[PDB]
């Protein structure tokens, strides 16, 4: 149920693990919905329904 756009799709270049509640656990070759992109860490959502921060270094602009 997609009401409208707000971010984009970004692929994970590398894997990571959520060491705190402010962050998330993601793997390379996965794609995530960004929500905020104005700083060093972007607010995205996993396909399982979980929101938090991940480093922009492992994120890349996916063409869809």
């Amino acid at each position: 149920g997609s009401m409208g756009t707000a971010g984009k799709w970004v692929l994970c270049n590398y894997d990571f693990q959520a060491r705190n509640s402010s962050e998330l656990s993601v793997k390379q070759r996965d794609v995530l919905e960004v929500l905020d992109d104005s700083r060093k860490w972007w607010k995205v959502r996993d396909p399982a329904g979980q929101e938090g921060y991940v480093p922009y270094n492992i994120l890349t602009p996916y063409p869809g």
Partner: peptide, 12 residues
């Protein structure tokens, strides 16, 4: 070199 400078307004 992943994990850049610490982000503002955390979830904790």
């Amino acid at each position: 070199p992943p994990v850049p400078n610490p982000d503002y307004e955390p979830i904790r």
